[PDB]
Design a protein around this ligand. Structure first.
Ligand SMILES: NC(=O)c1ccc[n+]([C@@H]2O[C@H](COP(=O)([O-])OP(=O)(O)OC[C@H]3O[C@@H](n4cnc5c(N)ncnc54)[C@H](O)[C@@H]3O)[C@@H](O)[C@H]2O)c1
Ligand SMILES: [Zn+2]
Lengths: 292, 7
C-alpha cells in the first residue's frame, strides 16, 4: 500500500497535508547554498575543486583532506578567505525548512554544509545534525587544550592572512569542520539510529549523494516513507556499473529537477504557504541588511 | 573511531 497518490510534487503536497505526515527529515547539501553565494563541487568551473592551481597541491582533493591539512594548513585558510561571503543570507530553501520547524513538522535537518546558514535561518541546535561540522565554532587542535574560538575570531585570522594560533598554547586553531578522512561526530550516528524509526517524509535537497556515510541516510527510512528530491539533477539512483524514480516498480520517490529555491517555492504554493514564505524571506533578508 | 568521511 503506497502512501503517495501520485509520484509528483502535487502528490507529495497532498500527502504532507494528510494526517499521516507528521515527521519530516531534510537531507541537504551544497546545492541549497549556491544561491547564497557559496560554491558547490558539482558546478563547472565555480565548484571548489576548480581554480586551485595557485595553491600547488599534490592533488586537488588534498585541500580538504585531513592528512594534508595537518602538514600544510595554509592553502585551506587562503581558500577560506577567498570564499568568505560578504553577507550570510539564507536562501528561500533554508527558510522553507524554517517553516517546517515553525509548523511542527521538522524532526531533523541533516546537513553536509558548513556555512552556518541553517542556524542563521533559525534552525536550532536540536533541529540540526551538522554531519560535516561547521565554521561557526573552531578549536585549538592540541588534545590537552581544545580552547574554543568564535567565528568572529576565526574570520579576523582568515582575513589578516595569519594562520590561526591558540592564544593559550600556540597550537593551530581549526574550524570545527569534518575534513575528508576524519570521523563524523557521534551525534550523526546516534541521531541516525533513532530518527528514521517513524519518519514520514524525506526531503532531499541540493546534494549529489556521493559523500559517505551521509549518502547512506536515504536508505535508513522505512520502505514506505516517500522521498522527494529537489535538485538540479537526478541523484541517488543506483549506479549501472537507492532512489527509484522511473522503473515499473517505482512507488514512493519523486524527483523535482530545478533550482532548490524554485522547487521549495512551488511546494510552498501547493501547501498554501507561498505568502508566508515570501514574507519570511523578505523580512529576514531586510533584517540582515539592516543589522549590517 | 567512528566511520570516516569519504567521497
Ligand atoms: N556550502 C557548503 O558547506 C559546501 C560547499 C561545497 C562543498 N561542501 C562539502 O563538499 C561535499 C559536497 O557534497 P554535496 O553533495 O553537498 O555537493 P555537490 O557539489 O557534490 O552536489 C551539489 C548538488 O546540488 C545541485 N545543485 C547545485 N546548485 C543547485 C541549486 N541552486 N538548486 C538545485 N540543485 C543545485 C548540483 O547539481 C549537485 O547535484 C560535502 O562533503 C560538503 O560537506 C560543502
Ligand atoms: Zn590551545
Amino acid at each position: 500500500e503506497r502512501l503517495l497518490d501520485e509520484l509528483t510534487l502535487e502528490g507529495v503536497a497532498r500527502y504532507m497535508q494528510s494526517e499521516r505526515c507528521r515527521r519530516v527529515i531534510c537531507l541537504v547539501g551544497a546545492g541549497i547554498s549556491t544561491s547564497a553565494g557559496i560554491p558547490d563541487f558539482r558546478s563547472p568551473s565555480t565548484g571548489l575543486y576548480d581554480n586551485l592551481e595557485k595553491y600547488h597541491l599534490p592533488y586537488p582533493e588534498a585541500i580538504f583532506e585531513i592528512s594534508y591539512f595537518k602538514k600544510h594548513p595554509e592553502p585551506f585558510f587562503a581558500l577560506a578567505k577567498e570564499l568568505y561571503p560578504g553577507q550570510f543570507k539564507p536562501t528561500i530553501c533554508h527558510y522553507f525548512m524554517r517553516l517546517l520547524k515553525d509548523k511542527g513538522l521538522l524532526l531533523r535537518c541533516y546537513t553536509q554544509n558548513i556555512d552556518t546558514l541553517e542556524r542563521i535561518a533559525g534552525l536550532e541546535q536540536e533541529d540540526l545534525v551538522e554531519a560535516h561540522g561547521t565554521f561557526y565554532t573552531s578549536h585549538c587542535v592540541s588534545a590537552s587544550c581544545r580552547h574554543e574560538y568564535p567565528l568572529s575570531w576565526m574570520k579576523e585570522k582568515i582575513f589578516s592572512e595569519v594562520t590561526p594560533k591558540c592564544e593559550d598554547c600556540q597550537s593551530l586553531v581549526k574550524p570545527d569542520i569534518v575534513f575528508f578522512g576524519e570521523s563524523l561526530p557521534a551525534r550523526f550516528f546516534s541521531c541516525m539510529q533513532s530518527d528514521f524509526l517513524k519518519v514520514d517524509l524525506l526531503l532531499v535537497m541540493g546534494t549529489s549523494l556521493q559523500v559517505q556515510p551521509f549518502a547512506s541516510l536515504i536508505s535508513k527510512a522505512p520502505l514506505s516513507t516517500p522521498r522527494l528530491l529537489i535538485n538540479k539533477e537526478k541523484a541517488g539512483q543506483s549506479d549501472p556499473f537507492g532512489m527509484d524514480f522511473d522503473s515499473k516498480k517505482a512507488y514512493r520517490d519523486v524527483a523535482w529537477l530545478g533550482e532548490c529555491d524554485q522547487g521549495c517555492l512551488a511546494l510552498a504554493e501547493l501547501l498554501g504557504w507561498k505568502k508566508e514564505l515570501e514574507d519570511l524571506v523578505r523580512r529576514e533578508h531586510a533584517s540582515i541588511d539592516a543589522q549590517s | 573511531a567512528l566511520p570516516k568521511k569519504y567521497g
